[PDB]
Design a protein around this ligand. Structure first.
Ligand SMILES: [Zn+2]
Ligand SMILES: [Zn+2]
Ligand SMILES: [Zn+2]
Lengths: 62, 237, 89
RNA sequence: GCCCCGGCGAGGCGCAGGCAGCCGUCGAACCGGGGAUGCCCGAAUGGGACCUCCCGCGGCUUGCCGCACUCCCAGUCGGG
RNA sequence: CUAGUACCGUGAGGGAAAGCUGAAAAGCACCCCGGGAGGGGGGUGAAAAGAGCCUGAAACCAGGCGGCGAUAGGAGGGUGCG
RNA sequence: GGCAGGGUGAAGUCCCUCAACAGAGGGAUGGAGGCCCGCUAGGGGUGCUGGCGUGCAAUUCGCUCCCGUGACCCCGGGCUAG
RNA sequence: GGGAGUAGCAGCAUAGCCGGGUGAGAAUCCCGGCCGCCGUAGGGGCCAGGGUUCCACGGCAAUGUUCGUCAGCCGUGGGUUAGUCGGUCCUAACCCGACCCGUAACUCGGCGUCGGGGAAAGGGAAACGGGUUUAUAUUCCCGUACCGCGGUGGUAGGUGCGGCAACGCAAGCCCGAGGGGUGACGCCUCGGGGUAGGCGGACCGGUCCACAAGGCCGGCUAAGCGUAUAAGCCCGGGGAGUGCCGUAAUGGCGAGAACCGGGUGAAAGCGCGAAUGGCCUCCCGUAAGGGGGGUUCCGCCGAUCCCUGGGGCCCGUGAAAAGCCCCUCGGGAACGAUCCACCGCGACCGUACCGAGAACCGACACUGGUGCCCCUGGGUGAGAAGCCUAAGGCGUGUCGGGGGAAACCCAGCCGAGGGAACUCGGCAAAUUGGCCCCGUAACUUCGGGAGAAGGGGUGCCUGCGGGUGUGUAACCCGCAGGUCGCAGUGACUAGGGGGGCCCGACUGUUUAGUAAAAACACAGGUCCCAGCUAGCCCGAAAGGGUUUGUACUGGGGCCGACGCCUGCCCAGUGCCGGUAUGUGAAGCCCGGGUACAACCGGGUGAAGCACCGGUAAACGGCGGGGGUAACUAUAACCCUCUUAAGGUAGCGAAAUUCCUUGUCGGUUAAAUGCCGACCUGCAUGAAUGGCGUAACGAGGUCCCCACUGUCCCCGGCUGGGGCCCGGCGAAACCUCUGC
RNA sequence: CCCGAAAACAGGCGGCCACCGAGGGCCCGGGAAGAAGACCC
């Protein structure tokens, strides 16, 4: 059905790989951009106020 | 609610987009720039099937080795000489301005304004008729029964389009219709709106029936123009 | 078999080894014979081969010694006759 | 972890209680100040990136310098 | 405290636990048993406080001690006595 | 990139005999089809309302049943986003 | 904590026993033998993914559903070698940047121009065999080759020939341009030539078998270099119609056949490579090591592998570019190769192992999924079927030991007499079954139904004939006779048939995980909008989809193969058109008012409304009465006034009917059933289609034949559990308790 | 006819032993008995 058996088709090519600028596995390989830092889509960093990721990385208060 | 198929077509997705990369090139006349009054000559090399033309095309080699495509007229042979210009003769396959084509002649691939390249009477099996000539305009009967006026410097080709009679043999099978609609990716198969749910269509519901007139005003907005759009009448006769 | 050899553009062959192993060999396919410009007939005196096979051949072993080797003899005679008949005046 | 100027005055070799051994009275470790070296990606910039790795063109003499885009001053040199 | 760490999610993101020997390592020489973890003798120390280390509660488990205990009816207690 | 094996026998192309105002019989070739049988591979999921139901499994197993040269099955590269 | 030393450690592949060894310790580790399983996959090769799981030595605290001396576990050391394999190069669908337009703006949206990316199964220079390591090898070593670039020395040629021709030749160098070919292509079907692999006979060695007869094993040869025919296509001669020539078939010929010669032109085979290389076997001290021999012939089958040719289908036409070969032209120098010989050089990354009933995903050493992605010996046999077996792999689809040890459950086998009396319902099980011959209905869209139905035969042995073929080679088709059994498609394989009704024309699709259908789609019928700066649609705009398009077209509805048909109503609701007047907002005008304005009144005033008309394969509707001619019922005919009109043909107790188990007939011993009719149609009806219909359906429903443990009425047997023994070891749940 | 000394008046009779040891069980060979126990030879 929709559960255990479709989980077997996760041997294709991955949706994300490592990013050269950010460091982590969020670079969309078919679109050509990163979902965490914006590399390939913007010179500037992805940085939203509703997000906690960069604050956590810098040990900051929300 | 949810969107209609004709609303989804406007956004231009692969599901609704034409596979033009499969087709022979576009078919256009040579420009007037090069044909001020030169009257070039050419020879037919080959006749070819086009998947996006409903008619066969012919390749022609010209003065300077240039190879162009034309809509093929009925009866044209490989190795014929075709002429384009004002002093060209009146023969099947030749292109002339409408001011040099007598009344009663069969014509195809006519231009709207001169230099356009060809817009009307292109389809397989069609033809138009010259009715009257004047200094201000020439008048032509089109395959819809409409009489239209053109500038007498608009170019046209003599004869009839090849490939007529397609619809005398029936399509017999859903599979053949599948292949035909996949050639040019038309939306196939087709659903009925009276059998959709209400979110999906102005028709729609458990009880499968249109609950109000199928005739719809010309001034209704998108999402509502389904049925008989601005119909002057309905029924058989 | 690697996926690149699971392609059917390789025309495999079964071959037995001096040591008795029966290995499989793979080769690429040979291109087709040359054709006439206008008539579309097959040309004689021109051999089939891949660039590798054709570059280890001298010039005179790759086409006949007569004018218009891109054509068949009939078409050649036609064009020659037309030239000479145009060259009267 | 390399160098120099000052301070302190005998021990020192990070969190980190070990083995084997080295540095220091030519003044160390440590502290204040000033220098050198400083791989790849990254605004990333000679050109490309489905993998932080690849591919070049000029000039000089194998090693070095220059070679992005949008502009200013100029002008077929250059300076910002 | 080797914490925005380990670990979860294709990703946007989410996110722990974990402090204390002794004044001094004086961190247990030597003997018997055991395949070995280890046990028993002996030692260090003011005190084993023994690295499974300050103090070391309750629930829970085992053994010993005291009372009852195989003809017998109530939410497990109250009053009066033996 | 793939689909064992077998059956039926459309158009097309013909042959023989008696003949003869007419005709009447008899033999082949050929290999179409959203044709047929088929646990070939592969795909699906009718009934037993079977086993299991803190399962081998957060949808599986077995018997039985259906399609199987096509509107067929599958792979690599791409597109459509609340 | 109790539950509990309990459940689970079975079911889809039931596997171990004997002897020996190691070790503290062995059902579980190693060696040998016997016994077993898989055998078009549980065998071999290799993507993605994983990332060291690979190799050796040393270990057993934990992990492994039990044990463990073992290990994908733990510790210590090691291991991936390329001019030729792949990436880099080309372009496909597609994406990005700069400029440009839009946006309050952007990390947002977009056309066109320029530029750049985009395939480890598309295109695309070049290597094969043997050996070597604990673990790598087309990568290391030996042998034998090839490609590109750059050179050294010579030669063809520049300044040369043979052939009627097709053509055959070493047949000049350097820059640029142009042209042609190749690269380069769908589906179905058939012929020919070969190969891998297999079968038979002889011979040589070895081995098994009480002798004999017989059985099994081995009997090898890569790239590269050099050599030719087939088909097809061509060149000369030749000169034909009551016709000749040919194919498996289609076919060919004065637009030049037969016939005679020739040219070009595949896969293969042959030769060198290459026989003290590989395999097999035989003889003495066994540490290195010694010597010797053999490596032969004939004949059949034959691919799903390779090459080459025909034919058929499309309202459907099945990639492009780089690169490579040839010709011509223009411009240069006088030298000089696409031929022979020799030398030099060739960068960067990958390369271990698994590749799945234990190395991937699913929380697991998960009966699932990813991958069956590529490939496979002998027999019977139509067969890649099922059954048996060789190679190769395994005894790790990781707990074992007992038993007349029950009841009961799961999966199976047989049952006297009767034969659906069971049940909502023949659910389930049973019956039939392969091949040859005979024979074959209603109905029909003449194609089918149809393997209709139904009936007869089949083994073994001894011989005799036929077909193609040169064949006492191979593969097929018939005949006679003798004989055995309860039974001869003896196991395996392997359809139960028929007659009615409803629905849907058919093949196809659907609610992943309670609905596979009567629901969707379908060919086809009919209606509507549109002449292109269109019609329909997206968007904030710029711009865009249909559009590389033009009425045989694009878009929008309803019905639903085929056959016969499709009646009346335009008053209402809607859509369309037209029109004098009327109404009609802002603006404009006029007047009054305000030292100016605000403000007041009138006029004009587009669309729309109103008014007049068309339209029902547009939405929908098709009623009412008051009265009946000859005696039992008839209102079957004719006027009427209500309203736009007043249900036509057909069908009817219906998948539509309330009363209803309607009435009559047929089917039963017995009928709330099924079929056929009757009309009182609560509340049928004509493209929200009406009435029929051959063929088809894991659709729904009724009957008949056969058959059966469904049932009378239950009985006996098999394997796995359950019970006992050893080992590991939970959870749901739980106020305290419990006649 | 079947069950029945746990019938709390928890019975009667005969015999053996005690006041080393009567008797009983494990064990061994087996069924007519049997899920473990029990029963019988
Ligand atoms: Zn990033
Ligand atoms: Zn030609
Ligand atoms: Zn020709």
């Amino acid at each position: 059905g929709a559960g255990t058996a479709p989980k077997g088709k996760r041997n294709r090519t991955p949706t994300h790989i490592r990013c050269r600028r950010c460091g982590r596995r969020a670079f969309n390989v078919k679109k050509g951009y990163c979902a965490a830092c914006g590399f390939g889509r913007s010179r500037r960093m992805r940085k939203y106020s509703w997000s906690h990721k960069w604050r956590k990385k810098r040990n900051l208060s929300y | 609610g949810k969107s209609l198929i004709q609303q989804r077509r406007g956004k231009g997705t692969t599901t609704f987009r034409a596979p033009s990369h499969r087709y022979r090139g576009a078919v256009r006349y040579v420009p007037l720039n090069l044909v001020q009054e030169r009257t070039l000559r050419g020879v037919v090399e080959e006749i070819l099937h086009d998947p996006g033309r409903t008619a066969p095309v012919a390749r022609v080699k010209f003065e300077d080795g240039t190879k162009k495509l034309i809509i093929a007229p009925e009866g044209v042979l490989v190795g014929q000489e075709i002429y384009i210009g004002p002093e060209a003769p009146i023969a099947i396959g030749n292109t002339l301005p409408l001011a040099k084509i007598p009344e009663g002649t069969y014509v195809y691939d006519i231009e709207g304004v001169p230099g356009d390249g060809g817009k009307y009477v292109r389809a397989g099996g069609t033809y138009a008729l010259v009715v009257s000539r004047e200094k201000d305009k020439v008048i032509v009967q089109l395959p819809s029964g409409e009489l239209k006026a053109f500038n007498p410097m608009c170019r046209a080709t003599i004869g009839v389009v090849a490939g007529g009679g397609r619809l005398e043999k029936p399509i017999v099978k859903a599979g053949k219709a599948y292949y035909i609609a996949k050639a040019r990716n038309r939306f196939w198969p087709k659903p009925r709106g009276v059998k959709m749910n209400a979110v999906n269509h102005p028709h729609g519901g458990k009880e499968h029936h249109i609950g109000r007139p199928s005739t719809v005003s010309r001034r209704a907005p998108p999402g509502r123009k389904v049925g008989h759009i601005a119909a002057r009448r309905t029924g058989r006769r | 078999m690697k996926p690149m050899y699971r392609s059917r553009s390789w025309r495999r062959k079964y071959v037995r080894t001096p040591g008795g192993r029966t290995v499989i060999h793979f080769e690429r396919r040979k291109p087709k014979v040359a054709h006439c410009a206008m008539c579309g007939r097959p040309l004689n005196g021109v051999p089939r081969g891949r660039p590798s096979e054709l570059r280890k051949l001298p010039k005179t072993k790759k086409r006949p010694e007569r004018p218009y080797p891109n054509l068949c003899p009939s078409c050649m005679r036609k064009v020659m006759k037309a030239q000479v008949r145009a060259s009267i005046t």
